Short mmCIF file of N, CA and C and ligand atoms in Angstrom, two decimals:
data_model
loop_
_atom_site.label_atom_id
_atom_site.label_comp_id
_atom_site.label_asym_id
_atom_site.label_seq_id
_atom_site.Cartn_x
_atom_site.Cartn_y
_atom_site.Cartn_z
N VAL J 1 -14.12 34.46 -11.92
CA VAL J 1 -14.99 33.17 -12.10
C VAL J 1 -14.65 31.96 -11.28
N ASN J 2 -15.63 31.64 -10.53
CA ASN J 2 -15.45 30.32 -9.36
C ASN J 2 -16.78 29.34 -9.68
N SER J 3 -16.49 28.33 -9.19
CA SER J 3 -17.30 27.15 -9.05
C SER J 3 -18.57 27.16 -8.43
N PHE J 4 -18.81 28.01 -7.38
CA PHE J 4 -19.99 28.00 -6.77
C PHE J 4 -21.57 28.16 -7.51
N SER J 5 -22.50 27.51 -7.34
CA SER J 5 -23.29 27.62 -7.89
C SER J 5 -24.83 27.96 -7.12
N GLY J 6 -25.64 28.56 -7.58
CA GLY J 6 -27.09 28.69 -7.07
C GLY J 6 -26.94 29.73 -5.77
N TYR J 7 -25.95 30.38 -5.74
CA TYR J 7 -25.84 31.52 -4.37
C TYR J 7 -26.79 32.62 -4.57
N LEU J 8 -27.58 33.31 -3.68
CA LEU J 8 -28.02 34.56 -3.53
C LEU J 8 -26.85 35.43 -3.12
N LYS J 9 -26.56 36.65 -3.89
CA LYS J 9 -25.75 37.38 -3.70
C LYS J 9 -26.18 38.70 -2.51
N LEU J 10 -25.62 38.75 -1.20
CA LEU J 10 -25.95 39.61 -0.41
C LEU J 10 -25.06 41.17 -0.32
N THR J 11 -23.98 41.04 -1.04
CA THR J 11 -23.17 42.08 -0.82
C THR J 11 -21.99 41.73 -1.86
N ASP J 12 -21.25 42.90 -2.24
CA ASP J 12 -19.98 42.75 -3.14
C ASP J 12 -19.24 41.44 -2.84
N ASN J 13 -19.26 40.90 -1.70
CA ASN J 13 -18.22 39.86 -1.40
C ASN J 13 -18.98 38.76 -0.60
N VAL J 14 -20.04 38.65 -0.11
CA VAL J 14 -20.89 37.63 0.87
C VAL J 14 -22.09 37.04 -0.08
N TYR J 15 -22.06 35.68 -0.34
CA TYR J 15 -22.86 34.80 -0.98
C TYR J 15 -23.77 33.97 0.00
N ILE J 16 -25.01 33.56 -0.45
CA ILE J 16 -25.54 32.69 0.58
C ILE J 16 -26.46 31.72 -0.21
N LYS J 17 -26.52 30.25 0.47
CA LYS J 17 -27.22 29.20 -0.28
C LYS J 17 -28.03 28.33 0.73
N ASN J 18 -28.94 27.79 0.53
CA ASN J 18 -29.58 26.57 1.56
C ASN J 18 -28.98 25.40 1.25
N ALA J 19 -27.94 24.81 2.03
CA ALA J 19 -27.22 23.95 1.38
C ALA J 19 -26.53 23.03 2.59
N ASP J 20 -26.37 21.62 2.62
CA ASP J 20 -25.60 21.08 3.48
C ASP J 20 -24.07 21.38 3.12
N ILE J 21 -23.30 21.78 3.83
CA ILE J 21 -21.79 22.21 3.96
C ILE J 21 -21.21 21.09 3.18
N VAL J 22 -21.48 20.13 3.95
CA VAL J 22 -20.63 18.63 3.64
C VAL J 22 -20.79 18.05 2.18
N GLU J 23 -22.04 18.38 1.68
CA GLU J 23 -22.46 18.08 0.28
C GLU J 23 -22.07 19.17 -0.71
N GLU J 24 -22.13 20.63 -0.45
CA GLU J 24 -21.57 21.57 -0.97
C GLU J 24 -20.11 21.37 -1.22
N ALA J 25 -19.41 20.96 0.11
CA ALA J 25 -17.51 20.90 -0.18
C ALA J 25 -17.33 19.82 -0.98
N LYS J 26 -18.24 18.46 -1.01
CA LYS J 26 -17.93 17.46 -1.87
C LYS J 26 -17.90 17.70 -3.39
N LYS J 27 -18.99 18.52 -3.56
CA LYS J 27 -19.43 18.92 -5.02
C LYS J 27 -18.52 19.92 -5.46
N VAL J 28 -18.15 21.10 -5.04
CA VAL J 28 -17.15 21.93 -5.21
C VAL J 28 -15.67 21.71 -5.01
N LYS J 29 -15.17 20.94 -3.86
CA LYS J 29 -13.61 20.86 -3.59
C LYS J 29 -13.41 22.33 -3.60
N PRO J 30 -13.59 23.09 -2.65
CA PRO J 30 -13.26 24.70 -2.77
C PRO J 30 -11.64 24.70 -2.16
N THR J 31 -10.94 25.62 -2.30
CA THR J 31 -9.61 25.59 -1.75
C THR J 31 -9.84 25.57 -0.04
N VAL J 32 -10.81 26.34 0.34
CA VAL J 32 -11.08 26.51 1.81
C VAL J 32 -12.27 26.19 2.29
N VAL J 33 -12.44 25.20 3.38
CA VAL J 33 -13.82 24.79 4.07
C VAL J 33 -13.74 25.36 5.39
N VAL J 34 -14.74 26.30 5.70
CA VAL J 34 -14.67 26.39 7.23
C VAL J 34 -15.30 25.24 8.15
N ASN J 35 -14.50 25.19 9.22
CA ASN J 35 -15.21 24.26 10.33
C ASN J 35 -15.57 24.91 11.48
N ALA J 36 -16.57 24.88 12.06
CA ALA J 36 -17.40 25.64 13.35
C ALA J 36 -16.57 24.61 14.25
N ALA J 37 -15.30 25.07 14.59
CA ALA J 37 -14.61 24.33 15.74
C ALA J 37 -14.64 24.58 17.11
N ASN J 38 -14.50 23.66 17.97
CA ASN J 38 -14.16 24.37 19.26
C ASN J 38 -12.46 24.61 19.64
N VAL J 39 -12.12 24.97 20.79
CA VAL J 39 -10.63 25.08 21.12
C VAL J 39 -10.06 23.89 21.09
N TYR J 40 -10.60 22.45 21.50
CA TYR J 40 -10.12 21.38 21.45
C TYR J 40 -10.04 20.44 20.26
N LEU J 41 -10.63 21.18 19.29
CA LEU J 41 -10.82 20.28 17.77
C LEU J 41 -11.43 18.93 17.97
N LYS J 42 -12.57 18.81 19.10
CA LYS J 42 -13.19 17.80 19.39
C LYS J 42 -14.70 17.67 18.35
N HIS J 43 -14.25 17.23 17.15
CA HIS J 43 -15.69 17.30 16.41
C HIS J 43 -16.78 16.40 16.64
N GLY J 44 -17.38 16.73 17.32
CA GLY J 44 -18.73 15.82 18.14
C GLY J 44 -19.95 15.96 17.26
N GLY J 45 -20.20 17.03 16.87
CA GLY J 45 -21.74 17.46 16.43
C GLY J 45 -21.51 18.85 15.70
N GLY J 46 -22.59 19.18 15.36
CA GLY J 46 -22.97 20.37 14.67
C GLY J 46 -22.32 20.11 13.23
N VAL J 47 -21.97 21.19 12.59
CA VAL J 47 -21.18 21.18 11.58
C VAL J 47 -19.68 20.64 11.54
N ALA J 48 -19.15 20.84 12.53
CA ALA J 48 -17.63 19.98 13.07
C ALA J 48 -18.10 18.31 13.03
N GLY J 49 -19.31 17.80 13.59
CA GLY J 49 -19.11 16.40 13.61
C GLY J 49 -19.54 15.93 12.28
N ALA J 50 -20.27 16.81 11.43
CA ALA J 50 -20.90 16.08 10.08
C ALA J 50 -19.82 16.37 9.12
N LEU J 51 -18.80 17.47 9.32
CA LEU J 51 -17.53 17.44 8.35
C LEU J 51 -16.48 16.25 8.67
N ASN J 52 -16.41 16.02 10.02
CA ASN J 52 -15.55 15.05 10.65
C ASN J 52 -15.75 13.41 10.17
N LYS J 53 -17.30 13.39 10.32
CA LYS J 53 -17.97 12.17 9.68
C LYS J 53 -17.77 11.72 8.06
N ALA J 54 -17.76 12.74 7.38
CA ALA J 54 -17.51 12.90 5.99
C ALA J 54 -16.14 12.54 5.57
N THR J 55 -15.14 12.63 6.22
CA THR J 55 -13.84 12.47 6.12
C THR J 55 -13.51 11.04 6.79
N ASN J 56 -14.53 10.05 7.50
CA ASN J 56 -14.19 8.85 7.73
C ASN J 56 -13.24 8.98 8.96
N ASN J 57 -13.43 10.31 9.86
CA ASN J 57 -12.65 10.52 11.14
C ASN J 57 -11.04 10.80 10.94
N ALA J 58 -10.69 11.19 9.53
CA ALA J 58 -9.39 11.54 9.33
C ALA J 58 -9.15 12.71 9.77
N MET J 59 -10.19 13.61 9.82
CA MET J 59 -10.39 15.21 10.32
C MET J 59 -9.91 15.08 11.85
N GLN J 60 -10.80 14.02 12.49
CA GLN J 60 -10.46 14.24 14.21
C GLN J 60 -8.95 13.47 14.27
N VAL J 61 -8.52 12.76 13.57
CA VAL J 61 -7.26 12.09 13.77
C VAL J 61 -5.95 13.22 13.79
N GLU J 62 -6.12 13.79 12.54
CA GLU J 62 -5.25 15.00 12.02
C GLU J 62 -5.21 15.86 13.60
N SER J 63 -6.71 16.29 13.90
CA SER J 63 -6.66 17.40 14.86
C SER J 63 -6.17 17.04 16.47
N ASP J 64 -6.13 15.62 16.45
CA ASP J 64 -5.79 15.08 17.87
C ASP J 64 -4.28 15.61 17.79
N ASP J 65 -3.82 15.00 16.64
CA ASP J 65 -2.14 15.55 16.57
C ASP J 65 -1.90 16.75 16.71
N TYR J 66 -2.75 17.86 16.10
CA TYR J 66 -2.30 19.23 16.26
C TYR J 66 -2.31 19.63 17.57
N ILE J 67 -3.50 19.19 18.19
CA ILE J 67 -3.71 19.57 19.72
C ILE J 67 -2.46 19.04 20.74
N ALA J 68 -2.34 18.10 20.42
CA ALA J 68 -1.09 17.10 21.25
C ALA J 68 -0.02 17.86 21.06
N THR J 69 0.55 18.67 19.74
CA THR J 69 1.68 19.52 19.53
C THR J 69 1.66 21.02 20.18
N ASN J 70 0.33 21.45 19.91
CA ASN J 70 0.31 22.98 19.85
C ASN J 70 -0.64 23.10 21.18
N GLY J 71 -1.45 22.67 21.70
CA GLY J 71 -2.43 22.98 22.76
C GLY J 71 -3.56 23.37 21.99
N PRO J 72 -4.70 24.00 22.95
CA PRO J 72 -5.90 24.54 22.22
C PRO J 72 -5.79 25.68 21.53
N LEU J 73 -6.89 25.83 20.68
CA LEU J 73 -7.02 27.31 20.11
C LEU J 73 -7.42 28.18 21.25
N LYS J 74 -7.43 29.73 20.73
CA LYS J 74 -8.09 30.39 21.48
C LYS J 74 -9.72 30.67 20.84
N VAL J 75 -10.55 30.86 21.68
CA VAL J 75 -11.85 31.40 21.31
C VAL J 75 -11.66 32.57 20.63
N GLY J 76 -12.15 32.85 19.15
CA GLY J 76 -11.72 33.80 18.15
C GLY J 76 -10.94 33.32 17.47
N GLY J 77 -10.09 32.55 17.43
CA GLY J 77 -8.85 32.05 16.43
C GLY J 77 -9.10 30.61 15.60
N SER J 78 -8.26 30.51 15.24
CA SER J 78 -8.26 29.55 14.01
C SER J 78 -6.95 28.57 13.81
N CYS J 79 -6.91 27.69 13.09
CA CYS J 79 -5.62 27.03 12.57
C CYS J 79 -6.40 26.51 11.13
N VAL J 80 -5.21 26.41 10.25
CA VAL J 80 -5.22 25.61 8.91
C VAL J 80 -4.64 24.24 8.99
N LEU J 81 -5.85 23.20 8.77
CA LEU J 81 -5.36 21.95 8.52
C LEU J 81 -5.85 21.51 7.25
N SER J 82 -5.54 19.91 6.92
CA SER J 82 -5.99 19.62 5.62
C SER J 82 -7.55 19.65 5.65
N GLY J 83 -8.12 19.77 4.16
CA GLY J 83 -9.32 19.51 3.75
C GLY J 83 -9.63 18.28 3.49
N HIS J 84 -9.07 17.00 3.76
CA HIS J 84 -9.12 15.93 3.44
C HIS J 84 -9.89 15.52 2.02
N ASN J 85 -10.97 14.86 1.90
CA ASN J 85 -11.53 14.86 0.57
C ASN J 85 -12.57 15.58 0.39
N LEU J 86 -12.82 16.96 1.21
CA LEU J 86 -13.99 17.93 1.01
C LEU J 86 -13.36 19.16 0.69
N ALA J 87 -11.92 19.30 0.55
CA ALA J 87 -11.53 20.71 0.34
C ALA J 87 -9.86 20.47 0.08
N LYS J 88 -9.37 21.56 -0.37
CA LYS J 88 -7.82 21.72 -0.16
C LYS J 88 -7.39 21.68 1.23
N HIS J 89 -7.84 22.81 1.89
CA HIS J 89 -7.43 22.95 3.25
C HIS J 89 -9.03 23.08 4.07
N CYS J 90 -9.02 22.79 5.49
CA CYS J 90 -10.01 23.32 6.18
C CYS J 90 -9.62 24.24 7.20
N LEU J 91 -10.04 25.45 7.21
CA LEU J 91 -9.71 26.57 8.00
C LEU J 91 -10.74 26.17 9.48
N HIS J 92 -10.39 25.74 10.56
CA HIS J 92 -10.93 25.79 12.08
C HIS J 92 -11.04 26.61 12.46
N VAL J 93 -12.09 27.43 12.50
CA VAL J 93 -12.19 28.81 13.21
C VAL J 93 -12.96 28.40 14.67
N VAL J 94 -13.01 29.07 15.79
CA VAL J 94 -13.69 28.95 17.06
C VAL J 94 -14.63 29.99 17.14
N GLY J 95 -15.80 30.03 17.02
CA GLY J 95 -16.55 31.29 17.40
C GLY J 95 -16.77 30.96 19.15
N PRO J 96 -17.15 32.15 19.58
CA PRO J 96 -17.87 31.64 20.89
C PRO J 96 -19.04 30.86 20.97
N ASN J 97 -18.95 30.17 21.98
CA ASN J 97 -20.04 29.08 22.22
C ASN J 97 -20.92 29.64 23.50
N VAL J 98 -22.37 30.45 23.09
CA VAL J 98 -23.00 30.95 24.07
C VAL J 98 -23.64 29.85 24.99
N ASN J 99 -23.56 28.71 24.77
CA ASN J 99 -24.02 27.71 25.97
C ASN J 99 -23.03 27.40 26.54
N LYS J 100 -21.90 27.99 26.41
CA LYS J 100 -20.99 27.91 27.47
C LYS J 100 -20.44 29.20 27.89
N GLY J 101 -21.09 30.28 28.19
CA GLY J 101 -21.03 31.45 28.36
C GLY J 101 -20.01 32.44 28.06
N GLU J 102 -19.53 32.03 26.63
CA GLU J 102 -18.40 33.08 25.89
C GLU J 102 -18.86 34.52 25.29
N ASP J 103 -17.85 35.22 25.57
CA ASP J 103 -18.22 36.44 25.25
C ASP J 103 -18.60 36.70 23.61
N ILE J 104 -19.88 36.98 23.01
CA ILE J 104 -19.94 37.16 22.09
C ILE J 104 -19.38 38.25 21.11
N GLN J 105 -18.90 39.23 21.95
CA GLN J 105 -17.82 40.06 21.18
C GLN J 105 -16.75 39.61 20.36
N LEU J 106 -16.56 38.22 20.59
CA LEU J 106 -15.39 37.43 20.17
C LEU J 106 -15.94 36.91 18.58
N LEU J 107 -17.28 37.00 18.30
CA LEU J 107 -17.69 36.74 17.12
C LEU J 107 -16.79 37.43 16.07
N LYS J 108 -16.43 38.78 16.14
CA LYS J 108 -16.10 39.48 15.18
C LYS J 108 -14.42 39.04 14.79
N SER J 109 -13.78 38.65 15.79
CA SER J 109 -12.32 38.21 15.76
C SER J 109 -12.28 37.14 15.13
N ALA J 110 -13.58 35.91 15.32
CA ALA J 110 -13.49 34.81 14.67
C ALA J 110 -13.44 34.86 13.31
N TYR J 111 -14.53 35.86 12.97
CA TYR J 111 -14.87 36.22 11.31
C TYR J 111 -13.47 37.08 10.67
N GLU J 112 -12.64 37.61 11.52
CA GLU J 112 -11.69 38.08 11.17
C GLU J 112 -10.42 37.17 10.57
N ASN J 113 -10.64 35.96 10.85
CA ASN J 113 -9.70 34.65 10.39
C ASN J 113 -10.32 34.45 8.55
N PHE J 114 -11.30 34.90 8.68
CA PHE J 114 -11.67 34.39 7.02
C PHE J 114 -10.52 35.08 6.17
N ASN J 115 -10.57 36.69 6.77
CA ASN J 115 -9.84 37.71 5.72
C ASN J 115 -8.42 36.99 5.19
N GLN J 116 -7.92 36.03 5.85
CA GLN J 116 -6.81 35.69 5.48
C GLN J 116 -6.81 34.85 4.39
N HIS J 117 -8.01 34.63 3.76
CA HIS J 117 -8.16 33.65 2.71
C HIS J 117 -9.23 34.19 1.51
N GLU J 118 -8.81 34.21 0.33
CA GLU J 118 -9.44 35.06 -0.80
C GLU J 118 -11.10 34.50 -1.03
N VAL J 119 -10.92 33.15 -0.93
CA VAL J 119 -12.25 32.46 -1.08
C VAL J 119 -12.68 31.36 -0.13
N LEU J 120 -13.74 31.54 0.43
CA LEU J 120 -13.88 30.16 1.43
C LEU J 120 -15.54 29.69 1.32
N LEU J 121 -15.67 28.45 1.87
CA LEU J 121 -17.13 27.87 1.96
C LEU J 121 -17.23 27.82 3.26
N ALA J 122 -18.46 28.61 3.96
CA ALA J 122 -18.27 28.36 5.40
C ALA J 122 -19.54 28.33 5.93
N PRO J 123 -19.92 28.10 7.25
CA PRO J 123 -21.21 28.34 7.93
C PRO J 123 -21.44 29.47 8.71
N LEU J 124 -22.21 29.76 9.05
CA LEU J 124 -22.59 31.23 9.88
C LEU J 124 -21.88 30.65 11.27
N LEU J 125 -20.56 31.36 11.59
CA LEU J 125 -20.03 31.45 13.03
C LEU J 125 -21.06 31.18 14.12
N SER J 126 -20.83 30.50 15.17
CA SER J 126 -21.69 30.41 16.48
C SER J 126 -23.02 30.18 15.98
N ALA J 127 -23.27 29.94 15.33
CA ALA J 127 -24.79 29.52 14.85
C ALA J 127 -25.00 28.24 15.39
N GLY J 128 -26.17 27.54 15.04
CA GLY J 128 -26.80 26.04 15.37
C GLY J 128 -26.22 25.83 16.73
N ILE J 129 -25.86 24.90 17.20
CA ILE J 129 -25.44 24.46 18.71
C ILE J 129 -24.59 25.21 19.26
N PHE J 130 -23.74 26.32 18.67
CA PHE J 130 -23.21 27.34 19.37
C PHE J 130 -24.36 28.36 20.05
N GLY J 131 -24.88 28.51 19.86
CA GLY J 131 -26.22 29.04 20.65
C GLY J 131 -26.53 30.57 19.97
N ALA J 132 -25.60 31.06 19.15
CA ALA J 132 -25.73 32.71 18.83
C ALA J 132 -27.15 32.73 17.84
N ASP J 133 -27.41 33.80 17.86
CA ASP J 133 -28.75 34.56 17.11
C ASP J 133 -28.04 34.29 15.54
N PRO J 134 -28.59 33.37 14.73
CA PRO J 134 -27.99 33.33 13.30
C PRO J 134 -28.01 34.83 12.50
N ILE J 135 -28.86 35.70 12.71
CA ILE J 135 -29.12 36.86 12.23
C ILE J 135 -28.11 37.68 12.37
N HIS J 136 -27.59 37.66 13.71
CA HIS J 136 -26.31 38.45 14.29
C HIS J 136 -25.35 38.15 13.63
N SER J 137 -25.19 36.67 13.62
CA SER J 137 -23.74 36.12 12.71
C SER J 137 -23.73 36.73 11.52
N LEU J 138 -24.75 36.55 10.87
CA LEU J 138 -24.61 37.01 9.43
C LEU J 138 -24.34 38.46 9.04
N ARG J 139 -24.72 39.37 10.28
CA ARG J 139 -24.47 40.87 10.34
C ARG J 139 -23.16 40.88 10.41
N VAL J 140 -22.56 40.21 11.53
CA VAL J 140 -21.38 40.35 11.88
C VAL J 140 -20.43 39.95 10.43
N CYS J 141 -20.82 38.90 9.91
CA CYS J 141 -20.03 38.37 8.70
C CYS J 141 -19.91 39.19 7.56
N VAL J 142 -20.87 39.79 7.28
CA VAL J 142 -20.98 41.07 6.33
C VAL J 142 -20.23 42.35 6.71
N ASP J 143 -20.13 42.47 8.12
CA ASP J 143 -19.39 43.89 8.53
C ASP J 143 -18.16 43.48 8.65
N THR J 144 -17.32 42.25 8.69
CA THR J 144 -16.33 42.03 8.97
C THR J 144 -15.40 41.45 7.75
N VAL J 145 -16.01 40.35 7.07
CA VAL J 145 -15.23 39.46 5.76
C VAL J 145 -15.16 40.47 4.90
N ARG J 146 -14.05 40.48 4.29
CA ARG J 146 -13.64 41.47 3.18
C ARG J 146 -13.48 40.66 2.08
N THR J 147 -13.08 39.36 2.20
CA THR J 147 -12.88 38.00 1.16
C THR J 147 -14.01 37.65 0.82
N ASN J 148 -14.20 36.86 -0.25
CA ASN J 148 -15.40 36.30 -0.85
C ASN J 148 -15.65 35.03 -0.25
N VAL J 149 -16.67 34.96 0.50
CA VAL J 149 -17.39 34.03 1.38
C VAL J 149 -18.76 33.56 1.11
N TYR J 150 -18.77 32.45 0.58
CA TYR J 150 -20.18 31.59 0.13
C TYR J 150 -20.41 30.85 1.49
N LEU J 151 -21.65 31.34 2.01
CA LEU J 151 -22.00 30.64 3.17
C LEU J 151 -23.25 29.39 2.73
N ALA J 152 -23.08 28.35 3.45
CA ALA J 152 -24.16 27.37 2.82
C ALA J 152 -24.76 27.29 4.32
N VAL J 153 -26.12 27.56 4.24
CA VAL J 153 -26.77 27.57 5.65
C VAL J 153 -27.72 26.23 5.40
N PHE J 154 -27.44 25.50 6.44
CA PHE J 154 -28.42 23.80 6.40
C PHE J 154 -29.74 23.92 6.32
N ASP J 155 -30.34 24.80 7.59
CA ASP J 155 -31.74 24.73 7.56
C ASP J 155 -32.48 25.64 6.70
N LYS J 156 -33.82 24.94 5.88
CA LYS J 156 -34.28 25.68 4.90
C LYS J 156 -35.15 26.91 5.61
N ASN J 157 -35.76 26.73 6.54
CA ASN J 157 -36.67 27.69 7.34
C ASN J 157 -35.70 28.64 7.92
N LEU J 158 -34.33 28.61 8.19
CA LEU J 158 -33.55 29.64 8.68
C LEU J 158 -32.66 30.51 7.59
N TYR J 159 -32.66 29.72 6.37
CA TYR J 159 -32.31 30.48 5.33
C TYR J 159 -33.03 31.57 4.86
N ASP J 160 -34.21 31.15 4.74
CA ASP J 160 -35.44 31.99 4.14
C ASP J 160 -35.66 33.09 5.17
N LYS J 161 -35.63 33.04 6.54
CA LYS J 161 -35.43 33.99 7.64
C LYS J 161 -34.40 34.80 7.29
N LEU J 162 -33.09 34.50 7.21
CA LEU J 162 -31.82 35.01 6.88
C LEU J 162 -32.04 36.40 5.81
N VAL J 163 -32.61 35.62 4.73
CA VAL J 163 -32.62 36.34 3.48
C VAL J 163 -33.86 37.24 3.80
N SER J 164 -34.67 37.32 4.16
CA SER J 164 -36.19 37.94 4.14
C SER J 164 -35.53 39.02 5.35
N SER J 165 -34.67 38.87 6.36
CA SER J 165 -34.89 39.88 7.44
C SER J 165 -33.27 40.86 6.73
N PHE J 166 -32.60 40.33 5.80
CA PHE J 166 -30.99 40.99 5.57
C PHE J 166 -31.44 42.31 5.32
N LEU J 167 -30.58 43.33 6.10
CA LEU J 167 -30.48 44.84 5.65
C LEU J 167 -29.34 45.10 4.80
O1 W7S L 201 -25.15 22.08 12.47
C1 W7S L 201 -25.17 22.36 11.47
N1 W7S L 201 -25.19 23.64 10.84
C2 W7S L 201 -25.71 24.65 12.03
C3 W7S L 201 -26.81 24.80 12.15
C4 W7S L 201 -28.01 23.77 11.90
C5 W7S L 201 -29.21 24.37 12.10
C6 W7S L 201 -29.56 25.44 12.83
C7 W7S L 201 -28.31 26.47 12.72
C8 W7S L 201 -27.36 26.01 12.71
C9 W7S L 201 -24.96 21.07 10.22
C10 W7S L 201 -25.18 19.82 10.41
N2 W7S L 201 -25.12 18.80 9.80
C11 W7S L 201 -24.64 19.38 8.37
C12 W7S L 201 -24.52 20.61 8.15
N3 W7S L 201 -24.65 21.41 8.86
#
């Protein structure tokens, strides 16, 4: 049993809810919250900007130190940093940004990072300002992630479309 509430069960391991991932993290304080990161961990907008704002910029301060030491992530890659006030840990995962010309085939690699964690609160990778088709992102999620993932979908209209169209 875990603390996630009000989710629709899509599969054995994937759950979905129309929710602000910031507000969901604050309520649940999950072991892992996933950030929709870029390779520079520059948390300007989308999910990353919202998560970072909720940390009062502490996520960005930690991230800048991480990049100064390690250099940029790979598209499809991840790193584990603090979850600050939102979670124990933040898994910063870089899905391909279609609005920068990145190979959409890297979305499956991105979601494979989730398999290193038993339970996660996450957004749909490469959705929103990353430009991918969210219906595709949910299909890759279901077909790639084997651990327990709680997808908080920000847009109510998109949520209903994702549920209604789900095979
Ligand atoms: O961009 C965010 N989610 C991604 C998204 C939003 C709309 C349509 C598709 C994808 C976000 C922003 N702020 C808070 C929580 N999520």
